[PDB]
From a paper:
[name] is produced by the human pathogen [name] as an inactive precursor called proaerolysin. Conversion of proaerolysin to [name] involves proteolytic cleavage of a flexible 43-residue loop near the C-terminus. The protein is L-shaped, composed of a continuous globular N-terminal domain, Domain 1, and an elongated region consisting of three discontinuous structural domains. Domain 4 has no known function but contains the CTP, which is folded as 2 anti-parallel β-strands connected by a short α-helix.
Residue His-132 is required for heptamer formation. Our MD-based observations thus suggest that the CTP remains bound to [name] upon proteolytic activation of the protoxin. This was confirmed using two independent experimental approaches. First, we determined the structure of the proteolytically processed form of an [name] mutant that is unable to form heptamers, namely [name]. Not only was the observed structure very similar to that of wild-type (WT) proaerolysin (root mean square deviation RMSD of 0.74 Å for subunits A and 0.92 Å for subunits B in the dimer), it also contained the CTP, in an essentially identical conformation. The structure of [name] [name] and the experiments of binding WT [name]-CTP to Nickel beads indeed show that the WT CTP does not come off over a period of several hours, which is inconsistent with a Koff in the order of 10−3 s−1. Thus the binding of the CTP to Domain 4 inhibits oligomerization.
Numbering used by the authors:
A (entry chain A): 2 to 422, 445 to 462
B (entry chain B): 2 to 423, 440 to 468
The structure:
Amino acid sequence: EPVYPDQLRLFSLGQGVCGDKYRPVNREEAQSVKSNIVGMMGQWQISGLANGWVIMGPGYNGEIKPGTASNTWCYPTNPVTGEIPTLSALDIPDGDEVDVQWRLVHDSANFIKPTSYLAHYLGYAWVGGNNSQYVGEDMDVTRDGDGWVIRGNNDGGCDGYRCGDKTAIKVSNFAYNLDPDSFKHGDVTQSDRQLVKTVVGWAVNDSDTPQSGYDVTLRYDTATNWSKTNTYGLSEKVTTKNKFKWPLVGETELSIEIAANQSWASQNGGSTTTSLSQSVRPTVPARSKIPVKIELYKADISYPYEFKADVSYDLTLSGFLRWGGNAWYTHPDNRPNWNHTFVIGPYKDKASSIRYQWDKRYIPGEVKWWDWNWTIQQNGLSTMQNNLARVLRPVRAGITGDFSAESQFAGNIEIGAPVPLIPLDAQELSGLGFNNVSL
Amino acid sequence: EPVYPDQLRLFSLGQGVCGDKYRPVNREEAQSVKSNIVGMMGQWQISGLANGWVIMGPGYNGEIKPGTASNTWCYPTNPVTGEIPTLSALDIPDGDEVDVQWRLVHDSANFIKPTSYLAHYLGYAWVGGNNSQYVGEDMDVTRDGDGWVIRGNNDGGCDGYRCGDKTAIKVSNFAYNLDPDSFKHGDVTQSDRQLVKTVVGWAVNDSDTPQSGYDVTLRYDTATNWSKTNTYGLSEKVTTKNKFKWPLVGETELSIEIAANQSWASQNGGSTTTSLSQSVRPTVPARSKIPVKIELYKADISYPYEFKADVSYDLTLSGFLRWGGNAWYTHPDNRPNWNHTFVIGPYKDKASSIRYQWDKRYIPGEVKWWDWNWTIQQNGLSTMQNNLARVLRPVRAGITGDFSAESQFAGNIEIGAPVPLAGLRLEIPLDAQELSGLGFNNVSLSVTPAA
């Protein structure tokens, strides 16, 4: 009886009080899904469990201990069972688009068989070629437009009513979303940090009185030169949903942002300079001075990279629905020719989402496409779980190439031990890479 | 004025209703930290924002759209400001424990300088060596038992009152927690799922009535064995808080778990035998046969592995507190010699948590150790945020070796379409001896009515 974290719900209704149809999560259940519960809480949040127990936020190391809270972690009295497992991503090596698609679509155990069986369980007829007795075998896969069509070989003869009407499965509308968090890197070569300029001087306090509460601020322009190569052509189509700053490898600081909604192959380099402003607040005793210092650096890196691009696509099933046994919610018996498309990947809408339909299967008002409860009666809960798990298995494509950067930046305005009682040659700092160094 | 995600608080008090001292997040704020809010929500969770907007769970692709929710994402009417930023990990290459420790405590920009400056801002006197004017410089790094000491070089004479009393920073009590989710793997050395045998035959229905009330069930035992290596000796002290299952790689569905509170280096292999059974409830018409096929597979896999172990340690600062300028809440003026240990890593208690003391800084009853507000008035908010972010910056050590696994498993039971003959009868030969020598034991195909 494993709790599903995605069904946990937090309520703020007093000690051990839950929303209708919910009951409080106990200490044991909380422990089994500790990482998931804590990852839904604020830093110093403290939330209630069953029977005078409490779970603390990530700031408190997520400790489960006795105590009181006016808010409560809760779980459905009648949870939804048999969630679809999320298997691990199917990694596909980098290459040209047509080659990455090819790999995926001719994959019998990972693609053809699960998508054929999906169609078969829904009630689609004759999902298999004439050269075999089993579903998802003897399956022709054909390039067609921007997509691919999988369909039982229809050559020769066959037995069974309307066996010539083989169902087809079209996969189309491929999209590739680069996930920054998947960032790997090869052997790091060029990786050094060199101090170029170390500015010095004094901050003098003459007035007979200890001096403090004055900032010796600094401002200047940093710089970052970067580039990168794309080993293959898939990169021409991959984008990233959100703009992100290129990651920080080694000690060489970087100020690079990858723009979202823009080809990865169209973002191969850049150059930026930003007006920063280090700061410091001294406390120099009466009639004394202090040694101030500001260091300037020049660093650069070079390393082969790799991100993961999440592959998504539309799955379109067309063929006729079997007499006296199909999953369409009206359960038609006149063998209608049917078309449905599921979006395999990010959620677009209810009609095209297996996971939405699956998880709402026990809400009558919601069943307007497939009757997933019927697939379970017919084929067993675990059988459907496994099939859907494989149909919905995240596919990932590698995005490779070489990277190389360079940046100049200042350090902290450090101030040292005072002594009983600062020049900025712009032409010098200009030629060092630091322009507009107005301290 | 940025919204701080870890201050958001979900309330279930009705449409647009927040708890005392909180008010509804608005669409604008929620978009700016969208990924963070969505990652705190259940799959198909839907929660209200201000002014008729709603934010949706990761099931719904984290969409912000019009709607009405009885639960509301909320945010302090009076938020705690200037949070300590959270820098990206400092990553240390795998190695023996000493080397890893060495790389850390001899890292000037990333360790020596930030821990020195922290000692300095807290008010510890003489945090620097005699051969420099600046704090954190000319700093002697010395091995001291199981830990390390950082302290300004005191060679010779120096100018200043009690200048000979250099402040010491001692790092001790390291711990290395393996983060399951940091898993990454090299190019798969060996990989393949091999068909070793296919069981084929027929299931027959002899009666004159269509039959669909019986299960055809396969059951069998399969061994799964696995082993791993640990490149270095740091692993002999690495552990994970909670047990976890070994990441799935390739199609080789494996059932392996690393136990908690047990050294990584002590879990290098194992074998499990599981009794598995799968079934089908075929409908077969009067006087007909259905083909049946069960494919059996051998799966083996190999690859270099690498996790990250989050590195934690105690930071003990010892020296005297300066006159007319120290951070201790009482603000002693008699230069008392002070000793204080911070835990750098997972929280243990209020007293030793910079992150806790910082975020609570504006609550007068919570100020029982250091006065972080004073450090802000003396040095500026940004100066402190940047120093503290440096000292709390996540330190991760790589944990490596090789992984290799081996299993056997059956594919699903597959049935074809009914053929007329020229309560279900099976004609599917099974050789116990051959199957056993193939790794499949106690193998049986059964026909029985199910419930």
